Design a protein around this ligand. Structure first.
Ligand SMILES: Nc1nc2c(ncn2[C@@H]2O[C@H](COP(=O)(O)OP(=O)(O)OP(=O)(O)O)[C@@H](O)[C@H]2O)c(=O)[nH]1
Ligand SMILES: Nc1nc2c(ncn2[C@@H]2O[C@H](COP(=O)(O)OP(=O)(O)O)[C@@H](O)[C@H]2O)c(=O)[nH]1
Ligand SMILES: COc1ccc(CCc2nc3cc(OC)c(OC)c(OC)c3s2)cc1O
Ligand SMILES: [Ca+2]
Ligand SMILES: [Mg+2]
Lengths: 431, 155, 437
């Protein structure tokens, strides 16, 4: 379990995907050219997890950029770390997907998926011990959702023994009022429920609410939202990229976090919540970090954990802090809120510490929860999907690409069963 | 039979074709299999020019299909504010109920069309209207945790 | 003499093994490179420590130990550590991917990748032995490798060495210092498939060790090194009779005779005393009677339970240091009267006593102050069933919902084995009831 192969598809997938590399690279001393320029020796121990070391002492990200629209690849290279990627790892088509899941999954995406698999095959053959695959995309678009789930399915067959990890951005009317996005999301969820081991649900609804109400940003921009995404992705991957006491991998995380195969959608949380050019006040204490990361306002999925029950939880504390102070504060939040943790899963809260803090913060806490309250995210998508599907609005866009209306019903039926499963274990008792 | 050609023209947004078809006696109130009229299709796909033309030549603004959907229903669902303005100006039933018990306010709130929610409210949208499941527009906002919508429904 | 081969499986078994062999060399005067200045025989001598150390041609004493792990990060530190030149390079075996805290991967999927190489290397050591007694296996209950692979290795060793003894040093999981939520599953699985292929198993509750470091050694947040260096002190007292001129428990066979009345109830409870903080280097020496009474104090037990809630089936007192036999007999005479230490009606109400007159050795850098006399009481009591009950309960809470079970079925395992493992445990708690508790 060493190498992780990163994949980013579509406009959203490549945007937050680029931000991810700009962040962890800054945290590992890698510059826009790939040369190590850090002052710590602990930032190269697990460096091979995400970077291929070139012979010239260079470090290149093990990432693959995909998109049916060439306009997104150009903007990536202009970005700071645009040249660090392998130019061969750019697989961009001509005609976009038009926000159509069917276009990305069955027609235009199908013509390009084979070319992307060849690049994925290359990256996997030159691996010492392939840990798994990591995908960043959005579920409301055409390329990331349509062609993204297609790649997931194809990679699941060719690499069935590896882990499938996704950073799926959920649509929301607060960011883009495109009534077809509930279609694309419900069809993608049906795929993610069957072909992935772990999915971090990054909800644009929660990202907007954080900036609008908490960060007091009246007109939130994609950069303001992705500022939260890059911080969440960095935290949830800190234990994969740094030594620490854990030496964690994608499989050990999945084994201890996913009690049931289909219930593998994680609710990420971060603290402190900041804005671009903010970092206000004087950090925060461990007790402040604990209460914030369990607060619904610090959640990246628009869900209230107090309306459900945690099945499993993983908290990472990054910074110089008393490991004893963390153990008690974590212990207090569990005995205090003992009702919000299932009794039939003993010791369902794991805590880790990494002295390397995130770059403009000294104390930080990232949270990963498998709570039954995530059903509210799927219910919101299901309500919007049903409202559009009942009126059969825009269905000719999908049927015209070969899709059948029975695939919509099968998609909605599957997502409703997922909500039912969460309610099962939210009201179950040891008895 | 210019009926099916007018329905297809309104759906595609071909204004010129709509003007010619109506000039050859095309039934402005034509309906397809499900009962949709040219005004239903023009409002569903945001063709403001075709919506007005139809409403100026005897289109039934409150026509319903087999499912009970009115033009304002579909416009409030897709989020076409301007078309919602015109429909209401020509006497659209702001509290029309379809086969699912949904009103235009239900659909606009479910799809997060906050501005359209305000327009429907200022035009007498029934906030106590329940659907087949007994949920009002406010119930939906409370169930989905949409604070912005909740604040609006409390005018 | 008669050799003993130590096997260390998983991160816990390997790091525990590191502490044990670090302490062994000190007790026997062996340097980190196998050099022993005060050895009469240069290329082979039937000495006491010879059972645990082989002798090369250049006077290098190599331990009869094997270190195995499905991932290399832990064993790689032994190869580059202080004892890099101590062990057989071919006896540090490692895979690429670990068991991912999954018993099924360690016993089926991943464990099969390296099971044959581990047995061949064991044969290399075995063929060097003139009279192999058996094996000392170290591992954890919760790890994916310590549970899955250990049971696989024990099953193989039973077929290839059907006449040899096999002793375990198993790490009992604890929430204070855990690593996975599926540890209860792995614990029941390995115990089920191992209960038959083992003669004597000494469990070490990480919580009990955790409490002793925080309470007797004054360590706020104990680390694995603190726990291990303390654990190695208990293991050293149990294996002392094998590495010296033992009169009690002279060979692995003697352990079952003195501690295991029945092949299935072979989980003796260990109690070590005294455990004094190295900062209190100037504490009054405790007499034989004082350290002997401490053994019957639950605070010094290696597994959290209550011996007063069950009957005794055997008791061995292993003293080390300045201990006069007259004082031991007197101390035992007082324990038989003062305390209500109740033995079963079918076992002699006596105490087996062994004395190693060598002072206890403490590792430099360790946290234990050097004492002039210590004792380790190996007692087979039905109170240990309490530890099995706590484990079975956590198992039942999860298996009732079939949580995490899909990870095991997908790694070449069947769900029926879960019910089988639990049925076997239920049959064990009852066996402890049929003897009194
Ligand atoms: N006493 C002690 N216990 C340990 C040590 N290291 C790990 N453990 C315990 O071992 C249990 C997990 O088993 P491990 O041995 O770490 O896992 P493994 O054998 O490497 O197998 P994998 O799951 O594949 O990693 C945890 O409950 C820990 O408490 C140690 O150094 N000393
Ligand atoms: N947070 C965030 N969301 C985005 C970004 N770009 C697109 N999205 C979301 O993704 C959805 C549109 O999908 P998109 O990725 O643009 O289509 P694609 O190019 O075919 O993959 C919308 O709901 C947007 O809210 C971005 O840069 N940041
Ligand atoms: C719920 O109970 C358990 C869950 C998991 C485990 C161990 C596995 C872990 N792997 C990771 C990986 C992480 O990031 C990549 C991460 O966030 C940074 C983690 O949280 C700190 C962890 S915890 C043990 C449990 O007892
Ligand atoms: Ca000798
Ligand atoms: Mg391990």
């Amino acid at each position: 379990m060493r190498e992780i192969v990163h994949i980013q598809a579509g406009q959203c997938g490549n945007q937050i995907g680029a931000k991810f590399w700009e962040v962890i690279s800054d945290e590992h001393g890698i510059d826009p050219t790939g040369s190590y320029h850090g002052d710590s020796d602990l930032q190269l121990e697990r460096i091979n997890v995400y970077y291929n070391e070139a012979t010239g002492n260079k470090y290149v990200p093990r990432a693959i950029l995909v998109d049916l629209e060439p306009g997104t690849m150009d903007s990536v290279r202009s970005g700071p770390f645009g040249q660090i990627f392998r130019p061969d790892n750019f697989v961009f088509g001509q005609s976009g997907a038009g926000n159509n899941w069917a276009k990305g999954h069955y027609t235009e995406g199908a013509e390009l998926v084979d070319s992307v698999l060849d690049v994925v095959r290359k990256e996997s053959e030159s691996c010492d011990c392939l840990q798994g695959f990591q995908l960043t995309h959005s579920l409301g678009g055409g390329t990331g959702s349509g062609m993204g789930t297609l790649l997931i399915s194809k990679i699941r067959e060719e690499y069935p023994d590896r882990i499938m990890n996704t950073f799926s951005v959920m649509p929301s009317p607060k960011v883009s009022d495109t009534v077809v996005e509930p279609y694309n999301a419900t069809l993608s969820v049906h795929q993610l429920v069957e072909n992935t081991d772990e999915t971090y649900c990054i909800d644009n609804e929660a990202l907007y609410d954080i900036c609008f109400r908490t960060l007091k940003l009246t007109t939130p921009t994609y950069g303001d939202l992705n500022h939260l995404v890059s911080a969440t992705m960095s935290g949830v991957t800190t234990c994969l990229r740094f030594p620490g006491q854990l030496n964690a991998d994608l499989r050990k995380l999945a084994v201890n976090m996913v009690p049931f195969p289909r219930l593998h959608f994680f609710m990420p949380g971060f603290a402190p919540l900041t804005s671009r050019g903010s970092q206000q006040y004087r950090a925060l204490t461990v007790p402040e970090l604990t209460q914030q990361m369990f607060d619904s306002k610090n959640m990246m999925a628009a869900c209230d954990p107090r309306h459900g029950r945690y099945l499993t939880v993983a908290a990472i504390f990054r910074g110089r802090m008393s490991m004893k102070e963390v153990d008690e504060q974590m212990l207090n939040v569990q005995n205090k809120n003992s009702s919000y943790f299932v009794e039939w899963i003993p010791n369902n809260v794991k805590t880790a510490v990494c002295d390397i803090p995130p770059r403009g913060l000294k104390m930080s806490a990232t949270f990963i929860g498998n709570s039954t309250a995530i059903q509210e995210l799927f219910k919101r998508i299901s309500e919007q999907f049903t409202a559009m599907f009942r009126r059969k609005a825009f269905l000719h866009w999908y049927t015209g690409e070969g899709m059948d209306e029975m695939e919509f019903t099968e998609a909605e039926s599957n997502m409703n069963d997922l909500v039912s499963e969460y309610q099962q274990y939210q009201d179950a008792t040891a008895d | 039979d210019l009926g099916k050609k007018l329905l297809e023209a309104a759906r595609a947004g071909q204004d010129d074709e709509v003007r010619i078809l109506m000039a050859n006696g095309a039934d402005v109130n034509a309906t397809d299999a499900s009962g949709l009229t040219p005004l239903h299709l023009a409002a569903t796909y945001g063709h403001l020019e075709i919506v007005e033309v139809l409403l100026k030549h005897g289109a039934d603004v409150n026509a319903i299909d087999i499912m009970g959907s009115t033009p304002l229903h579909l416009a409030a669902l897709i989020g076409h504010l301007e078309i919602v303005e015109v429909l209401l100006k020509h006497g659209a039933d702001v509290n029309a109920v379809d086969t699912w018990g949904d009103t235009p306010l239900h659909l606009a709130a479910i799809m997060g069309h906050l501005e359209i929610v305000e327009v429907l409210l200022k035009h007498g949208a029934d906030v106590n209207a329940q659907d087949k499941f007994g949920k009002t527009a406010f119930d939906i906002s409370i169930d989905n945790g949409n604070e912005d919508l909740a604040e609006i429904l409390q005018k | 003499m008669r050799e003993c081969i130590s096997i260390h499986v998983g991160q816990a078994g390997v790091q525990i093994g590191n502490a044990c062999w670090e302490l062994y060399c000190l007790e026997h005067g062996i340097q980190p490179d196998g050099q022993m200045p005060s050895d009469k025989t240069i290329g082979g001598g039937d000495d006491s420590f010879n059972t645990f150390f082989s002798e090369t041609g250049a006077g290098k004493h190599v331990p009869r130990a094997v270190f195995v792990d499905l991932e290399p990060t832990v064993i790689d530190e032994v190869r580059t550590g202080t004892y890099r030149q101590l062990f057989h390079p071919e006896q540090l075996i490692t895979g690429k991917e670990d068991a991912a805290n999954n018993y099924a991967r360690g016993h089926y999927t991943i464990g099969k990748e390296i099971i044959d190489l581990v047995l061949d290397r064991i044969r290399k050591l075995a063929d060097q032995c003139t009279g192999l007694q058996g094996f000392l296996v170290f591992h954890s209950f919760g790890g994916g490798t310590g549970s899955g692979f250990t049971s696989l290795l024990m099953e193989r060793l039973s077929v290839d060495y059907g006449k040899k003894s096999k002793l375990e040093f198993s790490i009992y999981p604890a929430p204070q210092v855990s690593t996975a939520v599926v540890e209860p599953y792995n614990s029941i699985l390995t115990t089920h498939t191992t209960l038959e292929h083992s003669d004597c198993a000494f469990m070490v509750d990480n919580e009990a060790i955790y409490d002793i470091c925080r309470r007797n050694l004054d360590i706020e947040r104990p680390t694995y090194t603190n726990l291990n260096r303390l654990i190695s002190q208990i293991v050293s007292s149990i294996t002392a009779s094998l590495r010296f001129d033992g009169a009690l428990n002279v060979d692995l066979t003697e352990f079952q005779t003195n501690l295991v009345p029945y092949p299935r109830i072979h989980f003796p409870l260990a109690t070590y005393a005294p455990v004094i903080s190295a900062e209190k280097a100037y504490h009054e020496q405790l007499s034989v009677a004082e350290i002997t009474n401490a053994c019957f104090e639950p605070a010094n037990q290696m597994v959290k339970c209550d011996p007063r809630h069950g009957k005794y089936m055997a008791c061995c007192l292993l003293y080390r240091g300045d201990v006069v036999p007259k004082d031991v007999n007197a101390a035992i005479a007082t324990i038989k009267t003062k305390r209500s230490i109740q033995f079963v009606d079918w076992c002699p109400t006596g105490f087996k006593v062994g004395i190693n007159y060598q002072p206890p050795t403490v590792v430099p850098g360790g946290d234990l102050a050097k004492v002039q006399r210590a004792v380790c009481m190996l007692s087979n009591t039905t109170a240990i069933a309490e530890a099995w009950a706590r484990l079975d309960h956590k198992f039942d809470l999860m298996y009732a919902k079939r949580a995490f079970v899909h990870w095991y079925v997908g790694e070449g395992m069947e769900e029926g084995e879960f019910s089988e493992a639990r049925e076997d445990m239920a049959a064990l708690e009852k066996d402890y009831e049929e003897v009194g508790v």
